[PDB]
Structure formats: structure tokens, C-alpha cells
């Protein structure tokens, strides 16, 4: 009856760039979502799945925690049916998605005096992502009829772009640590309960 | 019909700055980089620098290094350029230019140019 | 930086006459990005050829680019009265480029 290691995600000392979310599997443990819900530390706690007050009593075969950092305004893009630079080129939720999205204001930790440029996001892609698709390639993006020779310069862009995160940024431009909890029921006995 | 619309003529004193705008219409601004060039009367075109839209990459020609700044406002689909420490030598017509296509940025050339902005320093 | 040189600086041709403009790189310029432009006084430059080998959309068949390596040219099969203009070329390169050549002027003879 070991407690699920949520501290390995929410209390983590390092977070992934939005172009490459760091997924961790949660299994064979006792979940507690009420501690997150009632911490009142989160700027947002919203669900598209079962309401969080009932979610704790519902068992699942697999739970995934995907951790990453985005601008506070970008948080609105993380929902089923949404479009935008993050929703289409970095990560996408399915229309049938069950789960919750939790956001926390990290400006006190992720900001740096010279600015924090260690977080990247994908700016270019040939087509929209499939739900839960992840792409870590760094190949140069072609933006024209002329074949790209793989050398960055003109209509040959590095697909990733750094964030301009700074301590003086307005709230919409401040970094937020965001965790998305995905839930599924496979044809197996449940291993995660609360 | 694709258009680029630039701010009208402006006169500045030497040692002061000037700001020039260029607004896109009929085209997704995010689909392409915008570049700037100037032409003094009777002279050949001289490249200043460029900005990749949505990337913030603003590398400049060495001749204008730390003498020009290029920015963009995504909400107005408008490119901006500023010059500092102006000299009477800088009197010229300044132009913005871009590629034009729809969803795929297919054209590698510069299909659309603005009407140009006259800047006089004296 | 890539420096381009063009010749003749001034040309004099009759209407209906075939015309050629030439450009040469100061150094072994990479690939082919020598796009060509046309300009009239009081007006912005307009794209004719991109890739030094392909016509821009809406460009008449008489215009065509050519050449390779350091040596690039622009040709017009026959000059129209409308075609008398100042011409330029630009090298997009791998960035840190986009230098323009000195350009050429074509006058009516
Ligand atoms: C993170 O650690 C603190 C103690 O340092 C604890 O109070 C808090 O509940 C932890 N957060 C989570 C999500 O476990």
C-alpha cells in the first residue's frame, strides 16, 4: 500500500522543455489526489475527466504523469479540441481524453536574472501532432519549395525556439510548471487506487 | 491581395533615433521572416538585417551591428525597425519585404515589398 | 561576406533586342540563391527570378535566369519598352549574407 511517488514529479528539481515532455509511469501504488486538490498551491486545477473529488475513489490500470514548463497564457491550450502552437506542435490531447491538468507558478524558481533560456518549444512542424505524439528530433525545418541542405540559414530553421522567461515578465509570460495526469482502463486488473 | 503597408515619411535630427513600421495584410505573419533594406538616392540597395517571425532571431549585417534594432508585434502582424545614432549619411528610403504563400510558405523569393519609408536626417 | 560584382554597369539596347545581364561572385559562392529583381524610380524592387533558375508567379516567359558557381546571369529573350529598368541580384546563402550586387541599368537605344 505504498503511496504513489507524486513527489518525484511535483517536487522535482528539474523540468522538461515543452517540446519533449518527460513522461513518468504511475503504477502498483496508492494514489492521493486530495492532497493536491486541497493544497491550494496550484494556480489551476481542472479536469476533463471524472471530477477530482470522485477521482480519488476510482481505480485505474495505468496513470501517466507528463511534466513540462510553459508560459501561463499557454496553459489555456491544454485541453481536448484546442489548437495553437503548443496544442498542435508540442503536445495534443484526444477528444476522448480522461484526466486532469494542474498548473503551478514557477517564476520564483525558474526565473534567472539574465533570463532563463534553457527551456525550448517547437515553433515549426510540417503537420499537426497525433494525440500523445512526442517528437524529439532536431532536424532542420524546410520552409519552401527549394530542398533544404540541412544547413540552417534561410527557409531552413532550427525547429525549436527558446523561451524569453524573465523574473520581470507579466504573469501571462511567467513560466508555469504543469503536470498532466492521463488515465486509462486497459483489459487488466487495476493497480492504482486512492 | 497581399499587401505590405509602411509608415509615412519622417524627419529626424542627427544623433537621435527613428522608428519605421511595416504591416502585413492578407497573409499569415507567422509563416515567414521579414527583411529590411535601404536605398540612398542614386545608390545601390544596401541590406540592413532581418527578423525571423515567431523566432525572435534578429541577427544584423555587420555594418549596422548595434546601430539597428528589429522587432515585431505578433498581435498586429507588424514588423518594426529602429535606427540609432543617425547621421545625415543615413538619409534614404527604407523598405520591408517578405515571401508570400498560404499554409506552407512555398515561395522562397520575396513576393511582396512595401511602398517604402523616406527618412531624412538633418 | 559574399561580395557580388555586376556588369555592364550601364547597357544600351533597342526595344525588341535580346538582353543579358551578368553577375560574378568575389569568392566561391555556395549553391544558387541569386534571385533577380527589377526596379523603376519611385517604386519598390520586384522579384523576377528566384533560385536564379525559376520564374516568380506572374512573370512573363521572356524572363529566365542561368549560370552556376561564381557566374550567374539574367536573360530576356526580347526587350519590351516596359523592361527598361534597374536590375539587382541577391544571395540568400546560409544567412549572414543577403548582400546585393551593384546592379545594372538598361537604357533605350
Ligand atoms: C513536496 O514536499 C513538501 C515538503 O518538502 C510537501 O509538503 C509537499 O506536499 C510535497 N508535494 C507533493 C506534491 O508531494
Author numbering:
A (entry chain A): 333 to 526
B (entry chain H): 1 to 52, 52A, 53 to 82, 82A, 82B, 82C, 83 to 118
C (entry chain L): 1 to 30, 30A, 31 to 95, 95A, 96 to 107
Text from the published report:
The DNA-encoded Monoclonal Antibody (DMAb) platform instructs the in vivo expression of functional antibodies using optimized, synthetic plasmids. Total IgG was purified from sera pools, digested and isolated Fabs were complexed with stabilized spike trimer from SARS-CoV-2 (USA-WA1/2020; 6P stabilization).
A global density map of DMAb 2196/S was generated with a resolution of 3.1 Å. Only one 2196 dFab was present in the 2196/S complex, bound to the single RBD in the “out” position; the other two RBDs were in the “in” position. The epitope of 2196 is accessible only in the “out” configuration.
